[PDB]
Amino acid sequence: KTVFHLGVTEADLNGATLAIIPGDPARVQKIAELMDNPVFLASHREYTVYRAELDGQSVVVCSTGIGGPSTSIAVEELAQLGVRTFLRVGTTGAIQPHVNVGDMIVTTGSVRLDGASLHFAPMEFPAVPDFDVATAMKAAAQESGATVHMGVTASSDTFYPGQERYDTFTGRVVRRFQGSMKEWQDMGVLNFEMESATLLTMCASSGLKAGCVAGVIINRTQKEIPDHATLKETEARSIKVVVEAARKMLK
Amino acid sequence: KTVFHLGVTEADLNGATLAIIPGDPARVQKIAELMDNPVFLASHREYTVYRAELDGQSVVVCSTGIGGPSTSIAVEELAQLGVRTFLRVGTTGAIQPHVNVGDMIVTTGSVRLDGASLHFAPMEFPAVPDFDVATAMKAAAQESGATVHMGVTASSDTFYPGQERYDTFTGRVVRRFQGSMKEWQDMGVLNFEMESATLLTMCASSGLKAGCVAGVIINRTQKEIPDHATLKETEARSIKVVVEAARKMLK
Amino acid sequence: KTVFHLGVTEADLNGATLAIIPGDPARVQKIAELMDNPVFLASHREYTVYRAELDGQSVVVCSTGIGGPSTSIAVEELAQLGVRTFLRVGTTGAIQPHVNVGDMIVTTGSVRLDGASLHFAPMEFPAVPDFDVATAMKAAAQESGATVHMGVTASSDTFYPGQERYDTFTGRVVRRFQGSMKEWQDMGVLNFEMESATLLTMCASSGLKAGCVAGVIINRTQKEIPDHATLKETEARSIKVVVEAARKMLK
Amino acid sequence: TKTVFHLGVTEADLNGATLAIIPGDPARVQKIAELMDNPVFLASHREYTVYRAELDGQSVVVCSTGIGGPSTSIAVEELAQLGVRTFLRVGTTGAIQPHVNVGDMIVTTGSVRLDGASLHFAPMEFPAVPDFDVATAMKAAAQESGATVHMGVTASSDTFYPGQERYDTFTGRVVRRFQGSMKEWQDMGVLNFEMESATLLTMCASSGLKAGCVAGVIINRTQKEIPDHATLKETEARSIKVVVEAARKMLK
Amino acid sequence: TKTVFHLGVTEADLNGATLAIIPGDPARVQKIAELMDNPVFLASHREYTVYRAELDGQSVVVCSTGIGGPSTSIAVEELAQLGVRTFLRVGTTGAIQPHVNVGDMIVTTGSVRLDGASLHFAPMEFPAVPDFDVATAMKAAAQESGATVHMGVTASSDTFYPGQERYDTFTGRVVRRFQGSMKEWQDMGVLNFEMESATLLTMCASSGLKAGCVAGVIINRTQKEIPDHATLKETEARSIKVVVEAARKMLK
Amino acid sequence: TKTVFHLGVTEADLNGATLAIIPGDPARVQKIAELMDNPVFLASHREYTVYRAELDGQSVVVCSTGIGGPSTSIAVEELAQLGVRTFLRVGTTGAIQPHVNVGDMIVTTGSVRLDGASLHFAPMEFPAVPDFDVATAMKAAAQESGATVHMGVTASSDTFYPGQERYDTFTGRVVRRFQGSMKEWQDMGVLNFEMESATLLTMCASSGLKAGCVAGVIINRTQKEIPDHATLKETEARSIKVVVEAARKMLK
């Protein structure tokens, strides 16, 4: 009756059918405390799980860890317990010169640079969000006063070569990814992160509602390693937006 | 300059930056006449081109023919002549039992079962619409009184084997497509058509805004025959909806 | 009894088992009038259909539109009505310096740069003409007095990026097609067009005889512009050649 | 002097370590480190808990990877930036062959690349294989512990559920690519499923880094019996004793 | 002045030959050469036995390829460095259509590329098709010999066993890719299986060389998997008479 | 019992052998057999020359493969039908790393699958890896001989020319897939090129057969010096002494 990795039961969720799924286990309590009656449920591996209440309805907050594989486990196990809507929040690197640190991006579709999406649907299938979730995320971001961009997200199984970073141990990027950042830039792609392709393909092919919003922590036309100075303020804004987006999805 | 296939010049379009692109040449005049001052511009091969005025702004109506290849020529040549927004309309058959004849579908992403999309972006890239166009299409469709479905469309380079039809000369479907209709049904795909993967991938990777709307006229899962009045109503409603969606994009 | 797109019945074809399939609906009547007793049968979308008599035998002439998708519908529906041999006549761009405007090309195999051929056979399968049809087309083309080239044709789902054209709205070509025209030139490929890969693969995997012949309307390597008179003669010779090739196929 | 972005440590923090033991679970990091001398906590950020210890007088890092190739690839790269050149993966696992019993140990000789991150280092043709010295040391350490040791191929999946052909799930569906896959791997002699070795081995073998994987079997997909609690606890303890003894063999 | 790496012959050794007949079995080389005038042994190294001869006063090379695209690609390349521009393949084959009889001939109009070496010359989209004049010469030579000749598509496999969907093997298994493949090709109208035409035709058609393939049917897969030796000599004698007359038509 | 179709031998002809040494060149078969006791010629057909000998009182087969995965796959299959379970490949190789000299030996720990026949046994994700016992025996035999021995990844190509990125050819062209590929493999630490290991190791690892590859370096693609005849002859002799000693270590 406890799910295998997350360590929670259906009763622990207290009726929740919506989950906010940040990446970092440390963001879980912060998100829960933006809501009412936050309650710690479990922590195992990269999965920290809280419940809280938003306009009187239970919401679960569960970290995913980095990457499609760990995200896919959390989504499956939460779905087993009745969760049907998944709101992903995370950090991201902008590809376009005009998208600045602190701006918010809402993904309209993901470039599938991952492996786990292929475990749910063949490559032809679109990694696209639920329209209601994407609409809620746009409205929450805009209502908050943020600068918001809607568009395509390149979603990579690596932080380093698949985002065409060269300041690395080998300084090498495999042929597939050489020139890839400028290719995505010329195609209008807004940003890089590491989970949206898996999450959106999995949910869109499995009857689950999902969307992604992310705060820009670096502009890749400038540099490869994000500055620490701006991380906390961008993170605070993103989680305020995602909780408001959850409020708009409650029925 | 006159573009190679469409036979029109930039001056012929009178400043239009938006095009409505049906598949059937005979539907071009029917769409144009819902607007002010429709004028025939050209007809060559499958490309019949009219200009009209909507709220005082010039709009193009141009047929695409069947399939991504002929669609890709029309979109490119119109873009050479200043068009930046492309609204695809038609009627369609559904593959989900809950979708009824006369309902509308607004595509949120396409399964790329085509070839021409690969001439613009590798298969990983999402065949997704511009979010403003999809939003305007949803609103216009709802305001028509129709029941509207937002969701994924399977976009095939064939009418017969790629839609898993067996009632054919050979009665065979190649390995790739055996079992495919049930596969898409179980992944929540709403419908089949033959152009959206090429159109959406081309435009999303080229800085052009695109979307697709279709009224439903048949359903692979419901064996009954719809009434003539309903099919006539659905055709009329689809084109009223696309023109109202264009009005929302120009505003 | 009436096929879904072409609008004709088996009886309308008066026993024809051979069709000549140009791309452009306006060339159908021209081809039919080179034969005896031409009869208009139907026009719907890009499909204009005539019948005529050649040495006392019925022959269908049916346009395909541009691209594999629209071609695949016409071939299927004609095969449902008893047609077994398909002769494709069409325009092409030569990419070899020794091939001049006005020469003929008879395709011995196609580079499958399309999507619809994969709806009939996996990529490993050769896009190959029927040997009797290719033999008949070579003989007809040579007997006309034309200079005739037998060889490989690159068959693309786009006119622009898949033929490595840069004079376009974006001026970009996706990675797959960058450098591709020089690649095909160095591999001895003669020309680009947009339907032979689908046609030849579909027919060679479905028990239908097919072949393709084309007059060269431009050479991608020559800066000189062809005479209006030269293009006119080339158009006329191409259709006289395909009718002669049809004569040689009748049994 | 830089601190690497995800792990939050500097080169000086590692005290000269050129070998890392990389379990998946952050809670297992301290448990491995305490088998060595002078264990010290360095950092914990996200799924990455980092300790340093000393083995026969040499510095060794212990750093968790999280689940899956993506988070693993970050840890390996950032440790390599700080001088680490040898990576010893440890963990427990479930087998797909009837002759491999719970509590047995598997040393991977190559991985089926059912992941995505391996493709960010080398095209699919490239073999996901371990360094031969690491695999040799892992085999010897596993045998010296008294365990039954199997050398062979591991299927390394980006999912726990469909990519391991599990049907007891929310949708109950497995995509076409993975339908029949478990039987296919069983008939090809594959030993086990796990979720990180394809990425780890391909990344390292293509980047001048020495890597290997050793695991304890925590389930056998073909057996009805359920292992007892003592057996599972013994297998956990044995797997980390084994990887520390394999490290000792690599340092000498 | 060069001696090619594998064939062990120089351009002077070929006495001006621009046409080669390329059987697979080295023992067939002398048999083909003796159907022509003034045959001379040139070299034998590995699976490559090379003779020259004269046909209608013109020099002709005969060189074995061995089995498979890789060894064929070496012989074709090295002969092309020494001036050969036309390559006539003769070999044996298994029919996959019930009406084709043992002893019939097949002239390939295009090959299903079930090989790997063709991809070393052109991507998979490129058609494995013969030169039209060679195919035409082979059809006419085959008809004129009295044989029953079929023109059509050939499935060209890198293996004799699983890629031809044979089950009478050590494991009895066929990998997923090839399960059902023989019936799939049969329903697509494919005539036969062999092992070199995909590589040869793709290499040549993408390299400015003229090539074609003719093969004698030694088995029909409607009946059995292992060919009978009974009529093998008869089929082989007819096949080589045909290929020499096809060469005569190409020189004319 | 039956005579296998290509090799032309029966189970009784092998006198109980369950281990085969499989060189590439048919002329090397007798030389290997004569390093053992009581060598007996069994058959020669096409590229397949087959001998039997005795090693420490046990029957061993020696069978050539020809060049390439396709002809290798036939020999391994037919030997397996006759009871062979362990296959020791010896062959020549071109090194691509500057540190690997002519006369050194390479023992493959995994192959880059630049072939087609491996895909007839397992999908591309599957690793082309050796049996751990065979690789261990080859390393020991090679090191005990006094040779300098390298363990690592081998690029296994269906061509000698474009798939090894040679431009010194009739067209001077290398298809897009292989342009830049030698530097890519060099930077990924790949040791050498040959033409059979991917097929052999994938086939065997997915079919319950034990296989490994050892190779003598006959050229280095990064070196301008040409090796002298004496060095080449010594390398040839050492490679077959090594493979015989590795067989000795595999006998039970």
Ligand SMILES: O=c1cc[nH]c(=O)[nH]1
């Ligand atoms: O550049 C960035 C920043 C955050 N997360 C990513 O994946 N990439």
Ligand SMILES: O=c1cc[nH]c(=O)[nH]1
């Ligand atoms: O089934 C159908 C109906 C309309 N258009 C399509 O492409 N398929």
Ligand SMILES: O=c1cc[nH]c(=O)[nH]1
């Ligand atoms: O260049 C050309 C000319 C005609 N048709 C094509 O497809 N391309």
Ligand SMILES: O=c1cc[nH]c(=O)[nH]1
């Ligand atoms: O079955 C199992 C057990 C542990 N880890 C996995 O990935 N699969």
Ligand SMILES: O=c1cc[nH]c(=O)[nH]1
């Ligand atoms: O069946 C057969 C016979 C000969 N050669 C082949 O490749 N297959």
Ligand SMILES: O=c1cc[nH]c(=O)[nH]1
């Ligand atoms: O360079 C070389 C030398 C021998 N064998 C090969 O395959 N390549």
Ligand SMILES: [Cl-]
């Ligand atoms: Cl996060």
Ligand SMILES: [Cl-]
């Ligand atoms: Cl329409």
Ligand SMILES: [Cl-]
């Ligand atoms: Cl958008």
Ligand SMILES: [Cl-]
């Ligand atoms: Cl035309």
Ligand SMILES: [Cl-]
């Ligand atoms: Cl034919």
Ligand SMILES: [Cl-]
């Ligand atoms: Cl762990």
Ligand SMILES: [Cl-]
């Ligand atoms: Cl032969």
Ligand SMILES: [Cl-]
């Ligand atoms: Cl050898």
Ligand code: NA
């Ligand atoms: Na993780």
Ligand code: NA
């Ligand atoms: Na909206």
